[PDB]
Write an enzyme that holds these catalytic residues in place. Structure first.
Site, mmCIF file in Angstrom:
data_model
loop_
_atom_site.group_PDB
_atom_site.id
_atom_site.type_symbol
_atom_site.label_atom_id
_atom_site.label_comp_id
_atom_site.label_asym_id
_atom_site.label_seq_id
_atom_site.Cartn_x
_atom_site.Cartn_y
_atom_site.Cartn_z
ATOM 1 N N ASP A 178 0.863 -1.205 0.000
ATOM 2 C CA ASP A 178 0.000 0.000 0.000
ATOM 3 C C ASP A 178 0.893 1.246 0.000
ATOM 4 O OD1 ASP A 178 -2.063 -1.963 0.141
ATOM 5 O OD2 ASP A 178 -3.159 -0.885 1.758
ATOM 6 N N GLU A 237 -1.533 -9.745 10.845
ATOM 7 C CA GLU A 237 -1.416 -9.237 9.455
ATOM 8 C C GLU A 237 0.068 -8.985 9.140
ATOM 9 O OE1 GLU A 237 -3.760 -5.623 8.958
ATOM 10 O OE2 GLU A 237 -3.290 -5.682 6.784
HETATM 11 O O1 LIG Z 1 -8.948 1.832 4.815
HETATM 12 N N1 LIG Z 1 -9.526 1.382 6.014
HETATM 13 O O2 LIG Z 1 -9.110 1.922 7.237
HETATM 14 C C1 LIG Z 1 -10.540 0.369 5.986
HETATM 15 C C2 LIG Z 1 -11.363 0.299 7.100
HETATM 16 C C3 LIG Z 1 -12.366 -0.641 7.136
HETATM 17 N N2 LIG Z 1 -13.227 -0.714 8.326
HETATM 18 C C4 LIG Z 1 -14.303 -1.636 8.552
HETATM 19 C C5 LIG Z 1 -15.075 -0.771 8.894
HETATM 20 C C6 LIG Z 1 -14.261 0.251 9.558
HETATM 21 C C7 LIG Z 1 -13.116 -0.028 9.391
HETATM 22 C C8 LIG Z 1 -12.752 -0.376 10.127
HETATM 23 O O3 LIG Z 1 -13.449 -2.060 10.504
HETATM 24 C C9 LIG Z 1 -14.128 -2.421 9.589
HETATM 25 C C10 LIG Z 1 -12.573 -1.544 6.106
HETATM 26 C C11 LIG Z 1 -11.751 -1.475 4.995
HETATM 27 C C12 LIG Z 1 -10.722 -0.546 4.942
HETATM 28 N N3 LIG Z 1 -9.972 -0.580 3.673
HETATM 29 C C13 LIG Z 1 -8.526 -0.668 3.597
HETATM 30 C C14 LIG Z 1 -7.968 -2.096 3.589
HETATM 31 C C15 LIG Z 1 -8.390 -3.047 2.668
HETATM 32 C C16 LIG Z 1 -7.817 -4.320 2.707
HETATM 33 C C17 LIG Z 1 -6.827 -4.600 3.645
HETATM 34 C C18 LIG Z 1 -6.186 -6.021 3.701
HETATM 35 N N4 LIG Z 1 -5.189 -6.164 3.032
HETATM 36 C C19 LIG Z 1 -4.261 -5.066 3.086
HETATM 37 C C20 LIG Z 1 -3.052 -5.449 2.207
HETATM 38 O O4 LIG Z 1 -2.164 -4.349 2.140
HETATM 39 C C21 LIG Z 1 -3.441 -5.797 0.834
HETATM 40 O O5 LIG Z 1 -2.207 -6.071 0.046
HETATM 41 C C22 LIG Z 1 -4.213 -6.984 0.912
HETATM 42 O O6 LIG Z 1 -4.650 -6.926 -0.467
HETATM 43 C C23 LIG Z 1 -5.493 -6.539 1.666
HETATM 44 C C24 LIG Z 1 -6.654 -7.524 1.582
HETATM 45 O O7 LIG Z 1 -6.503 -8.474 2.603
HETATM 46 C C25 LIG Z 1 -6.402 -3.645 4.557
HETATM 47 C C26 LIG Z 1 -6.974 -2.378 4.517
#
Ligand SMILES: O=[N+]([O-])c1cc(N2[C@@H]3CC[C@H]2COC3)ccc1NCc1ccc(CN2C[C@H](O)[C@@H](O)[C@H](O)[C@H]2CO)cc1
Length: 765
Positions: A538, A735
């Site tokens: 990221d 993670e």
């Molecule tokens: O941006 N936010 O803070 C975010 C927050 C919340 N939430 C909900 C609702 C609130 C908040 C807080 O709880 C739940 C939900 C989604 C995000 N979206 C970002 C995000 C997307 C995927 C990943 C996991 N990793 C990260 C890897 O780097 C990547 O390579 C790998 O591809 C990926 C998939 O496993 C990590 C971060």
């Protein structure tokens, strides 16, 4: 024979506990069908239950941990849940009994054991929630012999095109049912199992917590009308018992109240098989599944030294089980920007500001529905398919059940649009959407993600070249089946290859850039000032500012991974006009890696940009990116360049922590800066790639074989012991791991590519 094994995988896999987003429920691999789910909650007061009740997975100070001890998606397994808030240790044994024409039968046992700190007389509200979606389908609760509810079993009889006739039994169970002395017992009974059968419009059946509470509230309102008050109030557990009203509906709430310990069974009988399933059947086919999971694990995951210990076997079965136990079925509409604005071409300086403008047009439309059967990074945080994550999830799953892995790859590639795009985050349906804040929902058909599924496909090919037991390996054991799989998939493989080269193209021919090839340069679309999300890494440091000039060495290396698989597959299919095009592009990439990305000054590969005065400038940020040609299996084992990379990996002052390889060098100026996501911490997925590559170089004649043996031996130990030590003390896979202390940080229940650790231990790559 191909279509024959096809029908048999369909029939083997149809049913499962395929709702990893909730602690426990079941659905088949069918968009609009029968779904079940478990809720529980201690009741100590008149207002507490709304706060204590459990449905969708979380991770807070309330919950010690939870996951699968064992699981096979074909047979079932056992999940343990350790709830501090509700003073409860729960077990959910789940088991499939094959038979008939509708994808078999199944059963589950829910056992709650109060922990030592819980009041011996605690009242626990438990719900089994049942929904069915469809126009031409029926589900009815067989009514009770008693007035107020059920002294024994609850029989749901139902039918659909998909499932045929079936019956779903919520058994009486063992455990103490509290009885009420109150006047209300004259109208609602003293306390018994109850059922409410209701109907809502199909698209809201999933919202089970709001649906449950609407009925609890309606029952409380009726008390307040019918003169029941605080002069003499019923006990809270009876205020929250639903008036029994069984019948016809697309929603059936089965509610039990237990004092102390409890258990009860759920029995799904497909009429199209023999006799119905019994509680005795569940006990037998559970025990027999433990034995089979037992046998398979020792064969598939035989842990080599120094992790043959029983402690590391426990750890392995856990890391594996949570990985494969995360498998879900998802169904519904993706949110997409199909506008293909000109601004997403990213050909201007300041392209990120342009692309912000296009996005604020809000032309994203729901489309589909789509289906996906895939494993997930995180039950509590990320219960959905991620494109490059699944490349890693399937390395161990392919070992366990190659036919399951090919089934999941098949599911993923069925998503590919006309142009060759697969969205990198699959948020299929209102239920999926409820976990994702609006900001992250919209997908973009110019946003790529590393093609790690090719690596599983590479491993399938090597296995090919060289009844549940039978069916797991049918697609290697029967070579013509293996090939027909590849024959059907190959065109989509090629389509994806072609789609990278069109949409993620680097610009040589417009700049003071010389190189062996004018074709082979790539740049990740989607990148902002601080971020390049589509790379997977990221916030890894990239050329500032970002610039249409940029070339990204990791992207080029992924195209290398794709082309090498294309060759291997193509040559098994006689795609000769293709295999030459591939060989010529592999040759060009190898050369262009050096010409555009190698730095002699810094002794590693680097991203490139274009300077304030329009020359090609290498930008070197010692870390995971810097190693990519090595991580992707692209360098000859004798190369001088490999040699300098092996120094960089092994050097404590740069990359080498006691806990594994750092995302970024302590010497790099962006070490530990900003969000510090990929700018120091230890990530198991990239470490796994290095570990595999070091072992390759180590089991081979060449100049580096002896170094690579020390580094493999040591890194394997460092990675495994870090993940193991953290599993031992916190109960979680994490993670990422802290480079200074080895502590697990960021999100828990990351199984998830952190489970790669089972295969690291297993060795013999
Ligand atoms: O941006 N936010 O803070 C975010 C927050 C919340 N939430 C909900 C609702 C609130 C908040 C807080 O709880 C739940 C939900 C989604 C995000 N979206 C970002 C995000 C997307 C995927 C990943 C996991 N990793 C990260 C890897 O780097 C990547 O390579 C790998 O591809 C990926 C998939 O496993 C990590 C971060």
């Amino acid at each position: 024979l191909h279509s024959e094994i096809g029908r048999l995988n369909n029939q083997s896999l149809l049913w499962g506990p395929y709702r990893p987003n909730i602690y426990f429920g079941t659905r088949p691999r069918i968009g609009k069908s029968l779904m079940t789910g478990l809720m529980w909650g201690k009741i100590e007061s008149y207002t507490d239950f709304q706060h204590t009740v459990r449905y969708t997975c979380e991770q807070n100070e309330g919950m010690k941990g939870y996951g699968w001890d064992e699981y096979d998606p074909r047979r079932g397994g056992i999940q343990s849940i350790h709830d501090i808030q509700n003073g409860l240790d729960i077990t959910t044994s789940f088991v499939k009994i094959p038979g008939g024409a509708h994808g078999g039968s199944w059963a589950a046992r829910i056992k709650g054991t109060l922990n030592d700190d819980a009041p011996k007389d605690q009242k626990t509200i438990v719900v089994f929630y049942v929904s069915q979606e469809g126009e031409n389908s029926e589900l009815e609760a067989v009514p009770s012999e008693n007035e107020f509810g059920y002294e024994g079993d609850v029989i749901l009889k139902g039918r659909s095109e998909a499932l045929g006739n079936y019956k779903l039994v919520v058994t009486k169970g063992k455990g103490v049912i509290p009885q009420s002395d109150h006047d209300l017992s004259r109208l609602r009974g003293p306390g018994q199992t109850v059922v409410q059968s209701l109907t809502y419009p199909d698209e809201v059946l999933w919202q089970a917590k709001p649906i449950l509470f609407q009925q609890l509230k309606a029952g409380i309102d009726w008390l307040v009308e019918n003169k029941y008050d605080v002069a003499d109030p019923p006990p809270p557990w009876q205020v929250y018992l639903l008036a029994n009203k069984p019948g016809s509906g697309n929603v059936h709430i089965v509610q039990k109240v237990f004092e102390g310990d409890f258990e009860f069974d759920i029995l799904f009988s497909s009429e199209s098989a023999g006799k119905e399933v019994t509680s005795k059947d569940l006990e037998r086919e559970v025990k027999q599944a433990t034995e089979v999971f037992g046998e398979r694990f020792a064969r598939v995951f035989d842990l080599k030294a120094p992790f043959q210990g029983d402690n590391y076997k426990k750890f392995g079965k856990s890391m594996f089980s949570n990985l494969i136990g995360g498998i879900g079925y998802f169904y519904g509409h993706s949110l997409v920007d199909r506008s293909y604005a000109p601004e997403y071409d990213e050909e201007n300086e300041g392209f990120w500001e342009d692309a912000a403008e296009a996005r604020a047009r809000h032309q994203e439309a729901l489309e589909g529905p789509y289906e996906l059967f895939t494993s997930i990074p995180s039950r509590p945080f990320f219960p959905r398919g991620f494109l490059w994550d699944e490349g890693f999830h399937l390395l161990p799953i392919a070992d366990w059940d190659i036919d399951l892995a090919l089934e999941i790859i098949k599911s993923w590639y069925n998503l590919m649009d006309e142009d060759g795009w697969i969205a990198r985050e699959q948020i299929l349906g209102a239920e999926a959407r409820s976990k994702v804040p609006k900001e992250f929902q919209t997908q973009y058909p110019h946003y790529a993600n590393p093609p790690t599924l090719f690596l599983v496909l590479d491993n399938f090919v090597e296995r090919l070249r060289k009844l549940d037991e039978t069916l797991s390996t049918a697609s290697v054991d029967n070579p013509e089946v293996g090939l027909e799989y590849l024959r059907r998939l190959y065109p989509l493989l090629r389509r994806q290859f072609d789609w990278f080269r069109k949409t993620q193209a680097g610009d040589i021919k417009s700049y003071d850039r010389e190189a062996y090839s004018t074709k082979e340069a790539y740049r990740w679309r989607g990148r902002t000032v601080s971020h390049c999300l589509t790379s997977g890494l990221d916030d890894y440091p990239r050329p500032q500012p970002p610039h249409p000039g940029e070339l990204h060495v990791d992207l080029m290396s992924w195209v290398g991974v794709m082309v090498k698989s294309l060759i291997s597959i193509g040559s098994l299919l006689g795609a000769t006009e293709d295999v030459e095009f591939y060989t010529k592009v592999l040759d060009a990439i190898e050369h262009n890696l050096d010409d555009l990305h190698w730095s002699e000054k810094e002794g590693c590969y680097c991203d490139a940009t274009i300077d304030e005065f329009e020359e090609h400038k290498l930008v070197c940020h010692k870390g995971y990116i810097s190693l990519f040609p090595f991580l992707t299996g692209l360098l000859k084992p004798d190369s001088p360049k490999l040699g300098k990379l092996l120094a960089l990996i092994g050097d404590e002052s740069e990359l080498w922590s006691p806990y594994g390889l750092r995302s970024l060098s302590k010497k790099d100026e962006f070490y530990g800066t900003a969000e510090n996501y990929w700018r120091s911490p230890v990530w198991i997925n990239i470490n796994y790639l290095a570990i595999v590559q070091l072992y390759n170089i180590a089991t081979q004649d060449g100049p580096y074989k002896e170094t690579a043996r020390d580094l493999y031996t040591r890194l394997r130990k460092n990675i495994v012991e870090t993940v193991y030590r953290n599993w031992e003390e916190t109960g979680f896979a994490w993670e990422q791991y802290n480079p200074e202390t080895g502590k697990g940080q960021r999100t828990q229940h990351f199984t998830g590519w952190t489970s790669l650790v089972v295969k690291i231990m297993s060795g013999h790559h």
